[PDB]
Design a protein around this ligand. Structure first.
Ligand SMILES: [Cl-]
Ligand code: NA
Ligand code: NA
Lengths: 149, 142
């Protein structure tokens, strides 16, 4: 069911975030996660001096995931408000093609082991983001997967 | 004169960039420079997890340079071309130049020159693909 999907999607994010935190610490390089609430996408990025933020091409994990239809995602930075607006959809984000330089991650996963404080929640369409399957960090890199409630 | 000012500014940016790279390496933290061509500003930033890029508050160098009004700046990257009231009282743009803890610096050239001249072959600071940082006088070096 969609609730079962939400769990699996939260475990997938947790595993990927842990992996990137581990990669940063072992490699001395900085990584990041870009969350796109309107397209329900998470992209896993590496910072290089010569090309800035790029998708991380690697032999451990895919670098972009998109939620299955029927799931939503949302996120908070630090103590702040949920990021997603109330619209059912962003009229501009429906278009696969440009209508009118990899965008920077909101979550930094630094070589020091520090991670941007945040909460990402994943939940069935029709529900609010609060008290859902969620992954949270704090600044020191401590990271939690939390069940609804 | 304005040409003497260009030199002094180029020399100062080299010194500040060298310190930033040295600090990145020594400290394991990431830094960067943001260049604002229109306003003639160079801003020296630090990457933190919790606040992203922010001005580098430190006790050794200033973290924002604004060139004197008779001067102009431009930069190229690698082989590219020249570039409300609150209800209760108690209710940073990214750098183009990354100065990473690995010691690597975004390949670039910044040139500083009297207002309205061409940016080529001016007092300049370059970070080459090699890793090296160079201060170069006007004209092509030997
Ligand atoms: Cl400077
Ligand atoms: Na994304
Ligand atoms: Na990319």
């Amino acid at each position: 069911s969609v609730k079962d999907e939400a769990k699996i999607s939260a475990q997938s994010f947790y595993q990927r975030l842990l992996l990137l935190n581990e990669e940063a610490i072992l490699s001395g390089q900085d990584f990041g996660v870009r969350i796109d609430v309107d397209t329900r996408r998470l992209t896993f990025l590496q910072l290089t001096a010569d090309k800035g933020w790029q998708k991380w091409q690697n032999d451990k994990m895919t670098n972009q995931t998109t939620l299955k239809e029927g799931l939503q995602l949302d996120f908070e930075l630090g103590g702040g408000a949920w990021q997603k607006d109330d619209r059912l959809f962003n009229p501009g984000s429906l278009f696969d093609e440009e209508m009118f330089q990899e965008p920077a991650p909101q979550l930094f996963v630094l070589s020091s082991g520090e991670v941007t404080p945040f909460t990402l929640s994943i939940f069935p369409k029709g529900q609010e983001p609060d008290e859902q399957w969620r992954v949270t960090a704090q600044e020191n890199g401590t990271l939690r997967l939390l069940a609804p409630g």
